[PDB]
From a paper:
All studied lectins belong to the seven-bladed β-propeller structural family. Each blade makes a W-motif composed of four antiparallel beta-strands (β1-β4) connected by β-turns and loops. The saccharide binding sites are located between the adjacent blades and are uniquely organized in two separate circles around the monomer.
The two versions of PLL differ in 12 mutated amino acids – five of them affecting three potential binding sites. Additionally, the protein used in this study lacks the His-tag on the C-terminus and is seven residues longer on the N-terminus. The electron density for the Cys267-Cys267 bridge shows one possible orientation of cysteines with sulphur atoms in 2.35 Å distance, corresponding to disulphide bond formation. Cys234 can adopt two different conformations, which can be explained as a mixture of oxidised and reduced states. Therefore Cys234-Cys234 bridge might not be formed in all PLL molecules. Our data from mass spectrometry (intact mass analysis) suggest the formation of both disulphide bridges, as PLL behaved as a covalent tetramer during this experiment. The PLL chain A blade W1 interacts with chain B blade W3, whereas in the case of PLL2, PLL4 and PLL5, chain A blade W1 interacts with chain B blade W5. For PLL and PLL4, only hydrophobic site activity has been shown, as αMeFuc occupied only H sites, and structure in complex with other potential ligands is not available.
Residue numbers in the entry:
A (entry chain A), B (entry chain A), C (entry chain A), D (entry chain A): 26 to 376
Write the structure that this text describes.
Amino acid sequence: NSAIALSGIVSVANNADNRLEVFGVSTDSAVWHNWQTAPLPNSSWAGWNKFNGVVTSKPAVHRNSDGRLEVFVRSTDNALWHNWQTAADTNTWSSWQPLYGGITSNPEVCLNSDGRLEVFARGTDNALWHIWQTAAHTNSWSNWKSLGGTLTSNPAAHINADGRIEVFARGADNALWHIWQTAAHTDQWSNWQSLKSVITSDPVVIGNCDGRLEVFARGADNTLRHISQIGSDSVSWSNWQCLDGVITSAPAAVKNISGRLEVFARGADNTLWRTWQTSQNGPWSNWSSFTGIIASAPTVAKNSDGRIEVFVLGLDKALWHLWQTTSSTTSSWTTWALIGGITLIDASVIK
Amino acid sequence: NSAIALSGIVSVANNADNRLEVFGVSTDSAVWHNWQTAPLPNSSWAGWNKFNGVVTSKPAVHRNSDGRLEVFVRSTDNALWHNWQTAADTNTWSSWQPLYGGITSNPEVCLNSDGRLEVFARGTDNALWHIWQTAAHTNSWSNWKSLGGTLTSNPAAHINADGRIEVFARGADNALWHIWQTAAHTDQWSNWQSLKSVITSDPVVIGNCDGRLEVFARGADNTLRHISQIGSDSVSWSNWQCLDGVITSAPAAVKNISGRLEVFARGADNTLWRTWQTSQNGPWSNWSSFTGIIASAPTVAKNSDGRIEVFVLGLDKALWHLWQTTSSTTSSWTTWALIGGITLIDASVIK
Amino acid sequence: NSAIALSGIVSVANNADNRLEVFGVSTDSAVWHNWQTAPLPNSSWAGWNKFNGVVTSKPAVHRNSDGRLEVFVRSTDNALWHNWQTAADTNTWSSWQPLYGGITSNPEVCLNSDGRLEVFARGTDNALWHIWQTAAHTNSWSNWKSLGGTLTSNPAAHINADGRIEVFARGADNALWHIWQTAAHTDQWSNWQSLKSVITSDPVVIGNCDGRLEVFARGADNTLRHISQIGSDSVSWSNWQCLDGVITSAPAAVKNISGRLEVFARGADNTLWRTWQTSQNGPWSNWSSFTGIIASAPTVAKNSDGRIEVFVLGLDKALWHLWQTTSSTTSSWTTWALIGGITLIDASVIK
Amino acid sequence: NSAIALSGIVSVANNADNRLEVFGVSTDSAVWHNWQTAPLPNSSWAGWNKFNGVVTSKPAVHRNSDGRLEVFVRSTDNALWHNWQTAADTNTWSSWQPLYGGITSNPEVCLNSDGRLEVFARGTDNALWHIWQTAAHTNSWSNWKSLGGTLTSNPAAHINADGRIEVFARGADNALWHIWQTAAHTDQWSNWQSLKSVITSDPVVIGNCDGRLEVFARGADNTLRHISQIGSDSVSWSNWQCLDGVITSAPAAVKNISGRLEVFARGADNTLWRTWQTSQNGPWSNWSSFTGIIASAPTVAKNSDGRIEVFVLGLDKALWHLWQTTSSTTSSWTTWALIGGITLIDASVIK
Ligand SMILES: CO[C@@H]1O[C@@H](C)[C@@H](O)[C@@H](O)[C@@H]1O
Ligand SMILES: CO[C@@H]1O[C@@H](C)[C@@H](O)[C@@H](O)[C@@H]1O
Ligand SMILES: CO[C@@H]1O[C@@H](C)[C@@H](O)[C@@H](O)[C@@H]1O
Ligand SMILES: CO[C@@H]1O[C@@H](C)[C@@H](O)[C@@H](O)[C@@H]1O
Ligand SMILES: CO[C@@H]1O[C@@H](C)[C@@H](O)[C@@H](O)[C@@H]1O
Ligand SMILES: CO[C@@H]1O[C@@H](C)[C@@H](O)[C@@H](O)[C@@H]1O
Ligand SMILES: CO[C@@H]1O[C@@H](C)[C@@H](O)[C@@H](O)[C@@H]1O
Ligand SMILES: CO[C@@H]1O[C@@H](C)[C@@H](O)[C@@H](O)[C@@H]1O
């Protein structure tokens, strides 16, 4: 059906020096951010810092090709705004600047392989729209342009190994649909094509170490399902497979430094669950639980030494995190620790 | 729930010279058999030949370690009987000889790695029972002995790569359960352990080319699901995965000569469907259909040159087959051809 | 150059019940054999038993498709003779029967996938010759027939996964050459083709679990080298790779029950060395040594529970063996133990 | 022995927008550079542009974590100097700035995973020395510090998947030696350890998509050899393997967008040769030749759409290039095309 599983409560990015930095919306409806002081999971965090301005979406973040983080959000009148570091690895930001338009989803940002950011969002006519940097890592943007379709989830964009951006979204029939650049980093796009099934979360996309994209989503029966490219184009995919175990949030996927995939999701008992590929391309482990009730989907990242780190909303409405203790992929994990200073709200547009 | 998907209509074996031979039950309630005259899929078949005697199960067949085929069936009073070739690759059979007992499933036969046949069946108390050759390829059998449990499907047995027989069956809770030799070819067995889930077919088991067993079955939502060993013991398995596509028979699995798995099943439109692993351990292709409505599950085998061949019941109640045209695993396939002479009935005990 | 590294001192086969049985030539110039009483590496051995008759080659053995072992040897006048078990798993043998011809290598036997044994040997004109069973597992043989070429090593034959026999031998230029059935189990053969390089041992061939043959041999610099099929035909192969470490015998290859390859050879210090694939298709481990000076190449086999076992000639001129302690492929190993009763000689024709 | 195979004639880097840029030494002994105008292999090139100043090494280049290219070279008095783009993707450079020291190899630069450049070179005492940025992408450098050893080749540095820099060099015994950070991006280093063998080129290092480093080098018999990590630490490696085919330059390695490795080297006939992995981890293809005699080792890079591109010195002493025609990894290749404007010299210090 048409449910959208609970989103992650923050977006995360690595800075130019790989320090992790998180962005979320507080009770004042402003975006706040916090960062590691050094790029290791046991680092202190700087503390929560506000960007002035009321917002009405989850903030999206990406690192420019010159190392500067840039954040995208929706304003009260549904326009898109963006902020950026004015130099890499520095806490001096531009404050919010306008890209106009009217959007009806969270904004989603991807980096073209020619160094230009590109933003995707659902529009007021429910089509997919996009806007892009016209020169790499420069505040020079295109006009808005439509890619059509009818969307019923937030979009997810990811670059193929050959540099073609590909965008995924739920359609009017609740199936997963996708559309792609047919030449890398150009405004030449395919038609929409359906990958069928029914999904009940936003899609989540990752690249494998054989150059094939893989998509994860919750399905109609509330279990995790996934599908992958089988060749070196966007057209031909595997069948869908679902894994046993009811999940109650969007999934978050990560490729560990051994090249194998891991997926995290809130489980049926409202704790964080993890599953991983036990061999090349499969199969998948039984889900393993971490202690503690959580109140959002996980958001996952990797530190400068490869260690996986996970962020979640706690029952105190604050952000908590845990991580791998060693770069070994069968390393033990820490238990939830607080990143205190503010509490957060779920501003995701499509919920 | 407690449905058991339609079974295959014949069992099949390779003779000592790899000629295929099929066994099924005709309208007279007798077992009839037919064989290739030469071990190639385009060979003529000898014609259907009767074993005298009324039976009340699907016949099971296995090749002894001396090359002689041996068939196991249930009689009207629920006892087990067996017949054998008196020399490899010859049509001179022993006629039915008694192993007594009382069984309430189809008999299932496996070959120990010390060359002794072993037969498994559900008993009159719904437990798993077994009986075995006490010397390899010899008509000298043990007494019947119980392995306990409560079974609600026919059993499926397969040997691990380390020589330990492992038996799979649906239990009273409709989950997949299993039990195993703890030392190869000995009467030292584990306790029953559940692999969970719910299955609505008999389980079907195959060995991968990394030494790991994999089990296929139809699930509660009538799609194919599968699970595999993740290590080099019987205890630790993957999570279950289900593949999209409703199936309407038991599946049949085969390892092609490139070492990759293929599964065949009757689909939702009552045609034969096939899916295959597109890479090592996964993922799986979309199902592909063959033309023609079929009236049983497929039974699958491989010829002396590796070519896959599939048998099914047609709407005329006769046996049909098709095969790969070349030893290439992306070879085209023939269309259904008749193996005429008799018509067949489904004598499977648990249906 | 034209050296041929020291051969194994026995051939070995698994009986129908998987008991290991070894064949070698004693100081009386007769073939003697010995066998496990039960199919486990720690089993007692029956004791050494003689086949009457003087021989002038290493004996070759293969199991027929009806489970009966059959041995091939050369007589004083260079004719081929064979002996067989008259029933599987029994010590009642036919005594030596004539196949005539004149051969100038050790005989090499392979089993076609239609159940017919086929023997290859160098002839008096240095070409490759062959002779075969005309019906599976029957004492009915063809006439001798030439496959041409010029051979400078003993031949090695192995069946492809699609049932085509392929034969390998060193040629007049000291390179590895090969020739193959172009249809499985038929007398339709390719032309000779060179795989180039230079080898200084007989070639040793094994099948991988993706259906590709791989060939091992000592090279000109006395290190192990190997080459593999890259597709699903006999024509297209990889480049050669050599592994560091000087070896002083023929290698012996085995596929462990995890599907990975291991190679054993006498090393530069005259001890047994082993190397194994640390991942799928590679790379290879550093050689690991077993304690004890040895006086032949290893001969390797697998027991009914998958455990690898190795046989060698000791400095006392008797046969010794060691094995894996568990079915785990990183299991510890036993130390050399004697299979006493006779001493052995190297009767290999081409040395 | 102590030969060092011919080096590449340029270094290459991707700009922040992925445009390729090459650096080499002309007949005036100055560094000149040239770049793609757009990041595609069929792009025009801007033309050759000079950095004023006489140099006495091959120039090394790396992209900072803020996207700015930075070049390292030796001056007449053997000191290290560096130049950088003052903004990403712009042709406004700092001109040469001093890092002093005295070096006796080409400088080699690597990027730590905390965004700090680090430079390695042989010193006047033949030990390995290093110097580093003390803050990411900032002109603030450490003092020089020794890592000891005795070097007889230029060093090669590469980051492990867990963020630890590892450095490779030939030692006084002509073997490959290595040393590594024991904590990522810290000045805590291991002792030197030997990987044995004998190499007759500089080592060339790449990371696989399972997180394992692999090293290529020419060996004593002038063939390509390679060795790889087998676990997730720096300590345990495979045996060495050599591939047939005599090579007459350093090799250049690249990971294609399907995750498989390819190696290029000048061959025995003075043409460019290529070999590639035909499966996961192996084996390797026979070498394939491109038409045309070449006068240096290849330098290899990848374009924004994944396409591989190769640079070489021609017999006219100018730079030529060729590339893949499509993002397919079995795509055809172009033939050599000139990047004209200057001629080049081999300034590599250790030759
Ligand atoms: C620029 O156009 C405005 O913004 C787009 C993103 C769409 O919502 C469109 O319907 C709207 O008119
Ligand atoms: C082009 O197709 C349109 O857009 C897709 C994204 C889907 O919503 C589909 O149902 C709709 O008709
Ligand atoms: C030998 O025992 C008989 O046969 C077994 C297979 C069981 O059905 C048992 O209950 C029955 O009494
Ligand atoms: C040992 O457990 C028993 O047998 C199994 C095969 C299952 O039927 C289970 O429900 C039952 O209690
Ligand atoms: C049957 O022919 C005889 O045996 C063959 C195996 C060859 O040695 C041939 O030269 C010889 O004449
Ligand atoms: C067909 O070629 C012949 O036989 C091969 C086996 C090689 O000995 C070769 O040198 C010889 O000319
Ligand atoms: C800073 O030290 C100088 O430069 C180093 C790189 C070494 O060559 C050293 O011997 C020399 O004295
Ligand atoms: C620490 O060891 C020293 O440095 C290495 C790099 C080698 O040159 C070795 O021969 C030398 O003794």
